[PDB]
UniProtKB/Swiss-Prot annotation, chain A:
Subcellular location(s) of the protein: Cytoplasm
Chain positions covered by the region annotation Disordered: 1-30
Protein name: Large ribosomal subunit protein uL3A
Native source organism of the sequence: Schizosaccharomyces pombe (strain 972 / ATCC 24843)
Function: Component of the ribosome, a large ribonucleoprotein complex responsible for the synthesis of proteins in the cell. The small ribosomal subunit (SSU) binds messenger RNAs (mRNAs) and translates the encoded message by selecting cognate aminoacyl-transfer RNA (tRNA) molecules. The large subunit (LSU) contains the ribosomal catalytic site termed the peptidyl transferase center (PTC), which catalyzes the formation of peptide bonds, thereby polymerizing the amino acids delivered by tRNAs into a polypeptide chain.
GO biological process terms held by the UniProt record: cytoplasmic translation; translation
Chief location of this protein within or outside the cell: cytoplasm
Highest taxon listed in the record's lineage: Eukaryota
Composition bias type Basic residues, residue spans: 14-27
Keywords in alphabetical order: Cytoplasm, Phosphoprotein, Ribonucleoprotein, Ribosomal protein
Gene3D superfamilies, per the entry: 3.30.1430.10, Ribosomal protein L3, domain 3, Translation factors
Biased composition (Basic and acidic residues): 1-6
Pfam families linked: Ribosomal_L3
Curated annotation (Swiss-Prot), chain B:
Protein family: Belongs to the eukaryotic ribosomal protein eL24 family.
Name by which UniProt lists this protein: Ribosome biogenesis protein rlp24
Naturally occurring in which organism (per UniProt): Schizosaccharomyces pombe (strain 972 / ATCC 24843)
Subcellular location: Cytoplasm; Nucleus
Function (record text): Involved in the biogenesis of the 60S ribosomal subunit. Ensures the docking of nog1 to pre-60S particles. Activates and recruits ATPase afg2 to cytoplasmic pre-60S ribosomal particles.
Subunit-structure text: Associated with nucleolar and cytoplasmic pre-60S particles. At the end of biogenesis it dissociates from cytoplasmic pre-60S particles and is likely to be exchanged for its ribosomal homolog, rpl24.
Highest taxon of the lineage: Eukaryota
UniProtKB/Swiss-Prot annotation, chain C:
Subunit structure: Component of the large ribosomal subunit (LSU). Mature yeast ribosomes consist of a small (40S) and a large (60S) subunit. The 40S small subunit contains 1 molecule of ribosomal RNA (18S rRNA) and at least 33 different proteins. The large 60S subunit contains 3 rRNA molecules (25S, 5.8S and 5S rRNA) and at least 46 different proteins.
Compartment list: Cytoplasm; Nucleus
Protein family: Belongs to the universal ribosomal protein uL14 family.
Entries under PANTHER family matching the protein: 50S/60S RIBOSOMAL PROTEIN L14/L23 (PTHR11761), LARGE RIBOSOMAL SUBUNIT PROTEIN UL14 (PTHR11761:SF8)
Annotated keywords: Cytoplasm, Nucleus, Ribonucleoprotein, Ribosomal protein
Pfam families found in the cross-reference section: Ribosomal_L14
Organism: Schizosaccharomyces pombe (strain 972 / ATCC 24843)
Physiological role: Component of the ribosome, a large ribonucleoprotein complex responsible for the synthesis of proteins in the cell. The small ribosomal subunit (SSU) binds messenger RNAs (mRNAs) and translates the encoded message by selecting cognate aminoacyl-transfer RNA (tRNA) molecules. The large subunit (LSU) contains the ribosomal catalytic site termed the peptidyl transferase center (PTC), which catalyzes the formation of peptide bonds, thereby polymerizing the amino acids delivered by tRNAs into a polypeptide chain.
HAMAP family: Ribosomal_uL14
Protein name, UniProt field: Large ribosomal subunit protein uL14A
UniProt key word NADP: no
SMART domains: Ribosomal_L14
RNA sequence: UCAGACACCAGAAAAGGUGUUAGUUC
RNA sequence: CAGAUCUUGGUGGAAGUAGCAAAUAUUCAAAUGAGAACUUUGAAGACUGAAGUGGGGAAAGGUUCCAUGUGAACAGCAGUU
RNA sequence: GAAGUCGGCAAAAUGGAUCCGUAACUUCGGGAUAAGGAUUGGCUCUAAGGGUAUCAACUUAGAACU
RNA sequence: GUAGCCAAAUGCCUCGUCAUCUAACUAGUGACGCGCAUGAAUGGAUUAACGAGAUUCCCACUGUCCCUAUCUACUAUCUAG
RNA sequence: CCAAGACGUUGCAUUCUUCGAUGUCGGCUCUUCCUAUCAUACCGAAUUCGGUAAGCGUUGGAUUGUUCACCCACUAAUAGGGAACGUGAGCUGGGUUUAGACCGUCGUGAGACAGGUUAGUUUUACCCUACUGAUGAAGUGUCGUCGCAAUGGUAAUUCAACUUAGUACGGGAACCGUUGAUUCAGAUCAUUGGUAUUUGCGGCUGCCUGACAAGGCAAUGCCGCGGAGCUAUCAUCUGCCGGAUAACGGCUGAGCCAGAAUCCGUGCCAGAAAGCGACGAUU
RNA sequence: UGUGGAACGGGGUAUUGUAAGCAGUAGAGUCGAUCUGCUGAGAUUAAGCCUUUGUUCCCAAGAUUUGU
């Protein structure tokens, strides 16, 4: 008789809570020694989202050279400070971290990440390491020479400057970013020169790039099969209820199959959202970052009244296409896309015409406070 | 561009409202559901205190 | 097929006229209403009612009107939709009632004129309906 | 290119196969 | 006697589990007291709303009436009531 | 807008009063609140309707204005 | 086996034949009758009004459904008993 | 298999278990497997017939309890089966359906009918396991940070229009490319819609606080709008190229080559709570 | 013991629709529905909005477990 495709994807289970708050990069772009030394991932915070007006330069389309309204996501990306380097050696059992070398000075932001109770502690983290770096710089030199001689993959330890974002959290987020391009010696000397220095997102991404955003989705709590998997609601006559799956299995096998929908956690799950195009890489110091070439109308990216439950974006930000996993103010990972793509949609350059900065809190009718007072008496 | 609503008579920005067409081929660009619903209730903006149509048509 | 007889593609807009829906007959063919019995280009989706939107080609019967037109299936084109749909420029459009016109399988209107507004998607998709349209919004 | 492997026993036939190894008669 | 869904009595796992979710709803201060969500007084908020959750009787009960006293037990929490 | 379902099951819709209007059929009694329409607030007013110049009492008709 | 009535709550064959209703009906109604196996106080044929009786259709109506979503109280849940 | 696709020939009821009871159709719901392949991909012949092939999909309705069915359409297509004739402590109760009742036939009768017609209680999980998700003691000194990846899972699908091109070929293609849609999957809440205890603001009725004002009650009194949150194939965003092959065609003359929606990996989800590493500080 | 936390206050943002009070050569009428001005006012605004040279207050502690 009649059949239907399955509800849900068997590739995204178990539908359990993510073991991590911050999106982990499970695959870095394939290393190319011809390319110059560069980073492959940046770590930011979801400020919010808004919408833009854009002229669509897509030949052969029904709305070629005609304005489109497009939703965009704003991720605040203050520069990340490089504080260490880790070397990975390929082995018949996979990658193994041979050694890790840290910078001389680590800020309180990243030192908190090593503590659960930073207020109580004696703040002893990396104190003896800071000493050994002071008197005995030779030991550091042998460690990086070991990385150059043996390790085949070089990853920099870089942390966010969370104090610069309007977040209550004071612990920074520290992650490994693979350094692709050049020889292993080139990566290590690049890491050494960038110790304690800030790497901005302008160098990593170039305003028309397709990236993969990685993060944990917002938790929706425990849900039933109707909402966790999308099954049909049972009829109103149903005794004991209807927001359930009627037949959870057959007589044989005499077990419940893993492929049958059950109630359980639906949310807080690690996702990798592919092919997100950067529409704008705005600078925090620039006062024109929300102004386009056709609009003028000096304005900042933060909507009038502030970003809802985030604050005011004063640092560098990235305006991305579509949506990203996770709620506002969650840490998000922006990695370079693994796949090479030559589609017209993915290759066309993006020119913004107007950016909405009205109040997302409520039905904002005014882009800027100045013209709000002009319309008002 | 920027369109002027018919009920509230304020300015509208792209993708911040609805446009409605009657039988007589007349087009109305509503700004918000509030003015959207008031118009279908046949509520005259000239008698409604927060509309700029009132503020211009009553001095 | 229904889409093959159309000139150019059409953007995904909100369906608002599922099967069993009676909508006004907007041309002068003499029919008064149209009863949607199926919609062209409807694949296989269990328990899912076929539905139409402005410019979609449907199979309709005349529930009220001239007796020669009733008791038969003839193709129709949905020209006005009361359910709001989002154009790609960001504007949401809906009409004051649901309306359609009588056409042959190729796409030529049986009537000679259309009363009331006509959706621009329907006009772009079907040149003959655009030609017979008085106003296109 | 989904060999075979111990009676009962847990099963397959006709007819073929440039598969191959031996034979029979012109 | 190991059996008879044996007889009588006792005791387990389930299990600190099912559960104690109809009848709108209680709150503050004080008193008493070893102990107060529940007793009492005052204040507040409410309900039954005269076909009452009011005031009485018949049938039935039988002392449950009243004052005083209170270790338990009973009032499926508590209890000075 | 019944496509649900064995079936409009459940739900929704209607609903008081005033005025207008009301079919087939019929045992002439009914059907009938058939079906279908319109009207309804507040306030300031008058207009009538009773008892011995004066008292007592809600009950309908309008008229504006809002 | 008359007057009647009928694929009727009565017809196996059978989803009978024809018409009507619908886009489509093994349904309903109207009709036909060699009616397995209808029929006249084991009452036949009707029939206004009535019916929490059985069966169709129409309008209005709607979360019945497309296709779900949201909200409130009480649970469940944790806790003391 | 055979030659004259005939003739032939070879193949793909019983009463063992249950009567100190295994709930007994269909539909709905939902997952999985099978290939004897309807569609899709790729090949071989002469649209049709074939081979590989189960990756992916296989619908909306009318009558009927249905089953086999049959109609009205859509669609690339609307293939056939297994799972205790899969699925009742999942539902529903239409079919079956004790007791009430009606009809026909049969019986002297009580009654019968494998004839039709109506009305007719659908219990319990709180145990074990399985399956969801949720913590979690302990090896690794302790605690923490950053990782590794064994293994398990896996995902995308189809169509149309345009350009090729009115060209090839003699009426009418295909490769490429392009713009869009279908089904499915994962998110998101800028905009739009829905939702209202924001009891947020306004309005309305009855009663009550002497009136005003301001409130209260009406098991959330009602009405309008309503931010935030939630949420919608009612909204938006996102959803690939490697290798080894089958059929099958070549190369030399086994060994290679080309070669499918197949297969295994890249990628994506989980992370072994008895797999591991680097690092930090060490009362 | 800090660009610390909290409780409020101020500003922004948003929702509603111009509050109460008083005043009027407004008001059908014989006191009076309503209207106008002050008045896009007033109320509400984080409860999972933003921001604060503000105001007041709080914090250098108990318990418990851990050795290469």
């Amino acid at each position: 008789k009649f059949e239907q495709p399955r509800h849900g994807s068997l590739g995204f289970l178990p539908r359990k809570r993510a073991s991590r708050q911050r999106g982990k990069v499970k695959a870095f772009p394939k290393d190319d020694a011809s390319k110059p030394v560069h980073l492959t991932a940046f770590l930011g915070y979801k400020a919010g989202m808004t919408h833009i007006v854009r002229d669509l330069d897509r030949p052969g389309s029904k709305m070629h050279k005609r304005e489109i309204l497009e939703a965009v996501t704003v991720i605040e990306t203050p520069p990340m400070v490089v504080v260490g380097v880790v070397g990975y050696v390929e082995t018949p059992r996979g990658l193994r971290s041979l050694t890790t070398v840290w910078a001389e000075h680590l800020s309180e932001e990243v030192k908190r990440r090593f503590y659960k109770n930073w207020f109580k502690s004696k703040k002893k983290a990396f104190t003896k390491y800071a000493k050994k770096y002071a008197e005995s710089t030779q030991s550091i030199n042998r460690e990086l020479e070991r990385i150059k001689k043996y390790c085949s993959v070089v990853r920099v330890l870089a942390h966010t400057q969370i104090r610069k974002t309007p977040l209550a959290q004071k612990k920074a987020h520290l992650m490994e970013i693979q350094v692709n391009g050049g020889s292993v010696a080139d990566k290590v000397e690049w890491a050494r020169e960038h110790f304690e220095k800030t790497v901005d997102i302008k160098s990593t991404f170039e305003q028309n790039e397709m990236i993969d955003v990685i993060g944990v989705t917002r938790g929706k709590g425990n849900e039933g099969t109707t909402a966790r998997w999308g099954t049909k609601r049972l009829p109103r006559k149903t005794h004991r209820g209807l927001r359930k799956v009627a037949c959870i299995g057959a007589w044989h096998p005499a077990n419940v199959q893993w492929t049958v929908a059950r109630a359980g956690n639906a949310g807080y799950m690690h996702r990798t959202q592919l092919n997100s195009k950067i529409y704008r890489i705005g600078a925090g110091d620039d006062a024109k970052n929300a102004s386009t070439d056709f609009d003028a109308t000096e304005k900042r990216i933060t909507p009038m009244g502030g970003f809802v439950r985030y604050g005011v974006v004063e640092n560098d930000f990235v305006m991305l296409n579509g949506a990203t996993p996770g709620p506002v103010k969650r840490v998000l990972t922006l990695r370079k896309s693994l796949l090479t793509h030559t589609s017209r949609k993915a290759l066309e350059p993006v020119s913004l015409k107007w950016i909405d900065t009205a109040s997302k809190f409520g039905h904002g009718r005014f882009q800027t406070p100045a013209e709000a007072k002009q319309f008002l008496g | 561009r920027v369109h002027t609503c018919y009920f509230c008579s304020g300015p509208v920005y792209p993708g911040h409202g609805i446009m409605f067409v009657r039988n007589d081929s007349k087009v109305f660009r509503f700004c918000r559901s509030k003015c959207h619903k008031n118009f279908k209730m046949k509520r005259n903006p000239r008698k409604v205190a927060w509309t700029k149509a009132y503020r211009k048509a009553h001095g | 097929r229904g889409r093959g007889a159309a000139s150019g593609t059409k953007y995904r807009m909100t369906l608002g006229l599922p099967v069993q829906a009676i909508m006004n007959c907007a041309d002068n063919s003499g029919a008064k209403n149209l009863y949607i019995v199926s919609v062209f280009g409807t694949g296989a989706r269990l328990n899912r009612l076929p539905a139409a939107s402005c410019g979609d080609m449907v199979l309709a019967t005349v529930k009220k009107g001239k007796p020669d037109l009733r008791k038969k299936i003839m193709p129709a084109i949905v020209v006005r939709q009361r359910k709001a749909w989002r154009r790609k420029d960001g504007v949401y459009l809906y009409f004051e009632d649901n309306a359609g016109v009588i056409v042959n399988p190729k796409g030529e209107m049986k009537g000679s004129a259309i009363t009331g507004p006509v959706a621009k998607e329907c006009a772009d998709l079907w040149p003959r309906i655009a030609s017979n349209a008085g106003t296109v919004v």
